[PDB]
Symmetry: C7
Subunit: 98 residues, 7 copies
């Protein structure tokens, strides 16, 4: 069991997505980069430094947060047949809560 | 309303107000490109974007309930309860409409 | 009791004081590209764009009633009550025309 | 009456003067791309652009009467009384020509 | 024993990934540099100057850190049959710690 | 006669380069303007206003300076036929001195 | 040598330390896209760029004699007495190689 620690304002997200199944039985993956997804925040970076080496701008997401994000610019990472993505917090569109 | 979408930064959630326009023959042809502006209702607003330094969030100029005119370009479609929603940057909001 | 359009940021609502480009055979050739500058009347103005400190809005240099020369590029057409309007950035306004 | 034009921001109104481009065959050829720079006279100047903070308009470096060298690109042609004028950003002005 | 010193916010990384063979014995390299990799930070730049130009903003990686990064924009450098990459600290996605 | 006064951070440069024939007596000029040239600074603008709005950032070239520069983005100006160029101080690569 | 080149801003003059690579037949083939990074010696350095304030020049992180790795892209070739030189921004310098 490894432990990934995102840098700057990048976060690690666990893809809660599932490929769509065609009626004929074919399964087409979601190569869709523009297609936004819903996942869970697993790790967050410290935050980006401001103009001067003063303070880190806290992120607006935390571990456990369910979020909607864009895959574009993201980096896929698999671990124990698990899908993960490393993306900038600016790609996160919104947080979904119950 | 079990689920609740909370936009980040200066993005907002808008509920599209419109209807599939029909052709004289009885056909409906939507707008996939999303290049025409639209009218909708602000459902949720983000906190806003952090200023240069990072000590203040510049408040947005729209609020829940506001009817606005916006550009779908760059926006993201989200359906829920057969309802159409769009997540866009407040910069895409052109004006607020008020009777 | 009537719909009123309110421009966000430094955008302004302008009304049409010109007609479509005419021809020698009578055919009306509209401009879809919107590359020719036009002349219109400022109908509504936005509050202005926030400075940086998030402190003050930089007032615009146009007011309702002003006749202005502007670029249609980047503008958004809006028709209401049968009149043609345009929502554009205050940066697209070239000059104010006064008697 | 004779309406006057009032440039906004750092834009200025310039009056153009062009030589006879008559080719040998008595054919004159205009510059559509407006790539070639020209010489003209500053007729009106804008107040100047606001600063980031919002405490001053940075004065322009040209004044009425100044003969200047400028790029037509980005400029907007305006013909009043047969004469040709141009509205351009002060950034397009290259140099001021003085006797 | 020449030693490389990265400038600004660039870091020198040692690629520790391994060419993969095809079922035919062939070997296929990744020239486009679009796939992220895992490596070890060998040297780090002082960091970028702040707005005011008085202090540099320290980087969030240190020598010995195992990182996940994007090869895009990076520059390959070989020395003693060892593969190295000079990249911007912005290309480093996360630090991997056992 | 007349004296050109550059605005902002633009400068007037007098081209010193001259044409070069071929083995056939032919001459090929540089329409592209991608080759850098050597010339003399004739007049310099006041300099660009700081973002603040209270100070002109002095340029690093003075009249009489021989400089190497890029013609790209430059504007040609012929007077008494002397070939001149109006370019941004940012196109000035270096100053050549004895 | 007599004439000496003095780089401006944060640009530096580097002396190309790269060589030819003859093919088995004889004929040697050189670079041409300028994407391949090179190694060379810093011969001269500019004073550095003035911050936004304009009160101070941010010193460069390279000095004369430094052996550096750099990108030729954006560089400008300069020959003299047979030796090849390049004028590039200090931003193209990747690292300093020391022994
Ligand atoms: Ca701060």
């Amino acid at each position: 069991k490894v432990n990934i620690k995102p840098l700057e304002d990048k976060i690690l997200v666990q893809a809660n997505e599932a490929e769509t199944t065609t009626a004929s039985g074919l399964v087409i993956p979601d190569t869709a980069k523009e297609k936004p997804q819903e996942g869970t925040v697993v790790a967050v970076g410290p935050g980006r430094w401001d103009e001067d080496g003063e303070k880190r701008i806290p992120l607006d997401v935390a571990e456990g947060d369910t979020v909607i994000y864009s895959k574009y610019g993201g980096t896929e990472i698999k671990y124990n047949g698990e899908e993960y993505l490393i993306l900038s917090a600016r790609d996160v569109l919104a947080v979904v809560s119950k």
